[PDB]
Amino acid sequence: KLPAEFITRPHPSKDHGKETCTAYIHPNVLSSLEINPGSFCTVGKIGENGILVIARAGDEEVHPVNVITLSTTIRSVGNLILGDRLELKKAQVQPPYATKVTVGSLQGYNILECMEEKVIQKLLDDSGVIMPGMIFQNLKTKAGDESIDVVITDASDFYLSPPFIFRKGSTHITFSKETQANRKYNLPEPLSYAAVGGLDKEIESLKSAIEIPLHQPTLFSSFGVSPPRGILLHGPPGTGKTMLLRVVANTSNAHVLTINGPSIVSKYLGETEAALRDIFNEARKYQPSIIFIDQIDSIAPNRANDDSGEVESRVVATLLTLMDGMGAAGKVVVIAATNRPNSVDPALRRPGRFDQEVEIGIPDVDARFDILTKQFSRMSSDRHVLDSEAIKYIASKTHGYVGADLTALCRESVMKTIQRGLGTDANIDKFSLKVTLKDVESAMVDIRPSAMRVYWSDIGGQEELKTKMKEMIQLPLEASETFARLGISAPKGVLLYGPPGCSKTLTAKALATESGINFLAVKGPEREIFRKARSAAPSIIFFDQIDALSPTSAANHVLTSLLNEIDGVEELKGVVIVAATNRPDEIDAALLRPGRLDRHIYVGPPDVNARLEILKKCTKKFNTEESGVDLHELADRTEGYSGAEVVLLCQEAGLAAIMEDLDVAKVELRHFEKAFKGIARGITPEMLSYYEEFALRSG
Amino acid sequence: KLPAEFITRPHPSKDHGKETCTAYIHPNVLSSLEINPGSFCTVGKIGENGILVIARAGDEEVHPVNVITLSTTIRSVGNLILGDRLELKKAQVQPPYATKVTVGSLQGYNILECMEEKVIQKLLDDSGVIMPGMIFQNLKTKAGDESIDVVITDASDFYLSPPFIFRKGSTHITFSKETQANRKYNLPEPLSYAAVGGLDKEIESLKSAIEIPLHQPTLFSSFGVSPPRGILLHGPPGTGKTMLLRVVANTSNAHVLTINGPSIVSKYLGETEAALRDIFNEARKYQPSIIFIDQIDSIAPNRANDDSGEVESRVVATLLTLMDGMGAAGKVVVIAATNRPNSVDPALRRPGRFDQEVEIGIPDVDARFDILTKQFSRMSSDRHVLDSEAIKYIASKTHGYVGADLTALCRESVMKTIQRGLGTDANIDKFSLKVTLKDVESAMVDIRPSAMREIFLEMPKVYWSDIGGQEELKTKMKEMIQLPLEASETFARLGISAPKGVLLYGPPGCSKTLTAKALATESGINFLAVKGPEIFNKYVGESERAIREIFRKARSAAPSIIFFDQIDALSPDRDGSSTSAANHVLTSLLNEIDGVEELKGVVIVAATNRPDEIDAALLRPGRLDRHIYVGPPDVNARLEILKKCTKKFNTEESGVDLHELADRTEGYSGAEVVLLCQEAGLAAIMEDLDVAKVELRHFEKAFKGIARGITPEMLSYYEEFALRSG
Ligand SMILES: Nc1ncnc2c1ncn2[C@@H]1O[C@H](COP(=O)(O)OP(=O)(O)OP(=O)(O)O)[C@@H](O)[C@H]1O
Ligand SMILES: Nc1ncnc2c1ncn2[C@@H]1O[C@H](COP(=O)(O)OP(=O)(O)OP(=O)(O)O)[C@@H](O)[C@H]1O
Ligand SMILES: Nc1ncnc2c1ncn2[C@@H]1O[C@H](COP(=O)(O)OP(=O)(O)OP(=O)(O)O)[C@@H](O)[C@H]1O
Specify whether the CB–CB gap between A24 and A56 falls below 8 A: yes
Q: How far apart are CA A448 and CA A397, in angstroms?
A: 12
Specify whether the CB–CB gap between A306 and A284 falls below 8 A: no
Rounded to the nearest 10 degrees, what angle do helices B659-666 and B696-705 cross at?
10
At residue B153, φ and ψ (nearest 5 deg) are: -95, -60
Rounded to the nearest 10 degrees, what angle do helices A242-250 and A200-215 cross at?
40
What residues does ligand 2 touch, defined as CB less than 6 Å away? B 195-196, 237-243, 339, 371, 403-404, 407
Q: How far apart are CA A261 and CA B367, in angstroms?
A: 43
Q: Which atom of ligand 1 is nearest to the CA of A246?
A: 18
- Please tell me what resolution, in angstroms, this structure has: 3.6
Helix/strand/coil for A258: strand
**Are B531 and A561 within 8 A, CB to CB?**
yes
Experimental method for this entry? Answer: cryo-EM
Q: How far apart are CA B315 and CA B266, in angstroms?
A: 11
Q: How far apart are CA A89 and CA A43, in angstroms?
A: 8
Alpha carbon nearest to ligand 3 atom 21, residue: B512
Q: What are the helix (H) ranges across A179-303? A: 200-215, 217-223, 242-250, 272-285, 296-299
Say how many C-beta atoms besides its own lie within 10 A of residue A658's C-beta.
Answer: 12
Nearest to B70 by CA among B57, B53, B85: B53
**Are A284 and B48 within 8 A, CB to CB?**
yes
Burial of B459 (0-12, 13-18, 19+ CB in 10 A): exposed
Helix/strand/coil for A169: coil
A vs B: CB pairs below 8 A: 110
**Are A224 and B411 within 8 A, CB to CB?**
yes
DSSP string over B291-306: EEEE-HHHHSB-TTST
Specify whether the CB–CB gap between A360 and A202 falls below 8 A: yes
Q: Which of A281, A482, A598 sits opposite B682 (nearest CB)?
A: A598
Taking the alpha carbons of A563, A566, A572, A576 in that order, is the dihedral positive or negative? negative
Residues 6+ apart with CB under 8 A from B368: B198, B395, B398, B401, B403, B406
Ligand having the closest approach to the CA of B298: 2
Q: How far apart are CA B69 and CA B54, in angstroms?
A: 12
Nearest to A615 by CA among A594, A591, A641: A641
Distance from Cα B462 to the centre of ligand 3, integer Å: 13
Helix/strand/coil for A632: coil
DSSP string over A550-618: ---HHHHHHHHHHHHHHHHHHHH----EEEEES-GGGS-GGGGSTTT--EEEE--S--HHHHHHHHHHH
Compute CA A221 distance to the chain's CA centroid, rounded to the nearest angstrom. Answer: 35
Q: Which amino acid is at B369?
A: F
Q: How far apart are CA A608 and CA B696, in angstroms?
A: 44
Q: How far apart are CA A330 and CA A214, in angstroms?
A: 10
- DSSP-derived pairing of the beta strands B627-628 and B501-505: parallel
Distance from Cα B409 to the centre of ligand 2, integer Å: 13
Query: What does each C-alpha distance from B242 to B3, B81, B372 come to in angstroms?
Result: 31, 16, 19
Q: Which of B260, B408, B414 sits opposite A223 (nearest CB)?
A: B414
DSSP B612: G
Distance from Cα A404 to the centre of ligand 1, integer Å: 6
B384: left (phi over 0), alpha (psi -120 to 50) or beta: left
Query: Which residues from A are below 8 Å from B682, CB to CB?
Result: 488, 491, 594, 598
Alpha carbon nearest to ligand 1 atom 10, residue: A240
Ligand having the closest approach to the CA of B363: 2
Distance from Cα B598 to the centre of ligand 2, integer Å: 30
Alpha carbon nearest to ligand 3 atom 30, residue: B671
Residues 6+ apart with CB under 8 A from B507: B609, B631, B669, B710, B714, B715, B718
Compute CA B498 distance to the chain's CA centroid, rounded to the nearest angstrom. Answer: 28
Q: Which of A62, A330, A569 sits opposite B458 (nearest CB)?
A: A569
Rounded to the nearest 10 degrees, what angle do helices B365-378 and B403-420 cross at?
40
Query: Which residues from A are below 8 Å from B260, CB to CB?
Result: 317, 321
Specify whether the CB–CB gap between A46 and A8 falls below 8 A: no
Specify whether the CB–CB gap between A495 and A579 falls below 8 A: yes
Nearest to A325 by CA among A281, A385, A271, A386: A281
Say how many C-beta atoms besides its own lie within 10 A of residue B608's C-beta.
Answer: 23
Distance from Cα B196 to the centre of ligand 2, integer Å: 9
Q: How close does chain A come to B120, measured CA to CA in Å?
A: 31
Q: How far apart are CA B46 and CA B66, in angstroms?
A: 15
Q: Which of A221, A224, A594 sits opposite B678 (nearest CB)?
A: A594
DSSP string over A43-89: EESTTT----EEEE--SSS-S-SSEEE--HHHHHHTT--TT--BEEE
**Are B415 and A355 within 8 A, CB to CB?**
yes
| Residues listed for chain A | 699
Specify whether the CB–CB gap between A602 and A462 falls below 8 A: no
What residues does ligand 3 touch, defined as CB less than 6 Å away? B 467-469, 508-514, 607, 609, 641, 670-671, 674
Q: How close does chain B come to A67, measured CA to CA in Å?
A: 14
Nearest to B563 by CA among B607, B510, B598: B607
Q: Which long-range contacts (C-beta less than 8 Å, at least 24 apart) are formed by A162-165?
A: A162/A95, A162/A96, A163/A40, A163/A52, A163/A93, A163/A95, A163/A129, A163/A131, A164/A95, A164/A96, A164/A97, A164/A98, A164/A101, A164/A129, A164/A130, A165/A95, A165/A97, A165/A98, A165/A128, A165/A129, A165/A130
A113: left (phi over 0), alpha (psi -120 to 50) or beta: left
Distance from Cα B362 to the centre of ligand 2, integer Å: 12
